[PDB]
Design a protein around this ligand. Sequence first.
Ligand SMILES: O=C(O)CNC(=O)C(=O)O
Ligand SMILES: [Mg+2]
Ligand code: NI
Ligand SMILES: [Zn+2]
Length: 331
Amino acid sequence: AQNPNCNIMIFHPTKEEFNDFDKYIAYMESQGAHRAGLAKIIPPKEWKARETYDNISEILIATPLQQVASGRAGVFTQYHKKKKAMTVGEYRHLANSKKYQTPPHQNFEDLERKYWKNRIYNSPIYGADISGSLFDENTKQWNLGHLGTIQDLLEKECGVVIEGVNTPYLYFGMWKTTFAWHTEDMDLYSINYLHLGEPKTWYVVPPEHGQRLERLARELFPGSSRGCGAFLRHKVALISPTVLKENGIPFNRITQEAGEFMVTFPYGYHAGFNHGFNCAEAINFATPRWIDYGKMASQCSCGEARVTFSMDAFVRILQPERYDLWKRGQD
Ligand SMILES: O=C(O)CNC(=O)C(=O)O
Ligand SMILES: [Mg+2]
Ligand code: NI
Ligand SMILES: [Zn+2]
């Protein structure tokens, strides 16, 4: 069995290997990359996403989200408070202000320590989930707005044509902006490209050990767990590396820098934080290996998780027994 310790693997495809996306995902899996739940892909030196980032300041962040924490330093939830619209130029200025800027630090490890010690005492503002793309239309390789769609994959594998579309999302981050412990909708893959700015630190639980994280989460968030049998779908719970180690939960960590892709694999729980002002782009995708994970994916039916239009068909076709209850939670 390849990669039996479930380590995060880093790949350096050549320009020729960067042509066929599906084929390279399948290569990474042949080497065991999926066992970790997350892989890093460093593009060939000849590649670029676009010519420059000099003209992005007029993008609008219609609903910036202030991420307010409750709990203790290593075990907390966050809620998202909606703020007034602002442009990317305005947001960048805010991120760099004395109230929000990254503190002085020695290295990534020192910054990680400061994150876990101090995150709860501040409420950073995240421009998340903005439909759109920063890839140039002329970038033909690993362009996140030109991937094969999940609807076409389901049709190819299963023969059923379904409604729905699949487009990318932009994330503008600042120091301490946080992504809570989650898997993707319907336990899909995700791919994330860090276009510019400061790094993003990731933590991940191997898919084969996801239920260990869920069991801890139920213990640590007992009110939430009573409210919903899949409350990590709400994307609000954080657990530090120190707490995971104390409870014996297998995980790994890695820092993504500008110009690098990360791929999350089906049922790979992940969480993390941004080091300072940055912009990432991400999208879900599927492969043939996903189908069995989509059929088994947990679902939130309590009403909180509220998701895209396009998840309807996935539940309807892959999980017909669950469909009626899940849709009640949508309505
Ligand atoms: O970048 C973020 O805030 C969150 N991204 C992801 O969870 C992802 O790409 O799967
Ligand atoms: Mg602009
Ligand atoms: Ni994700
Ligand atoms: Zn729920």
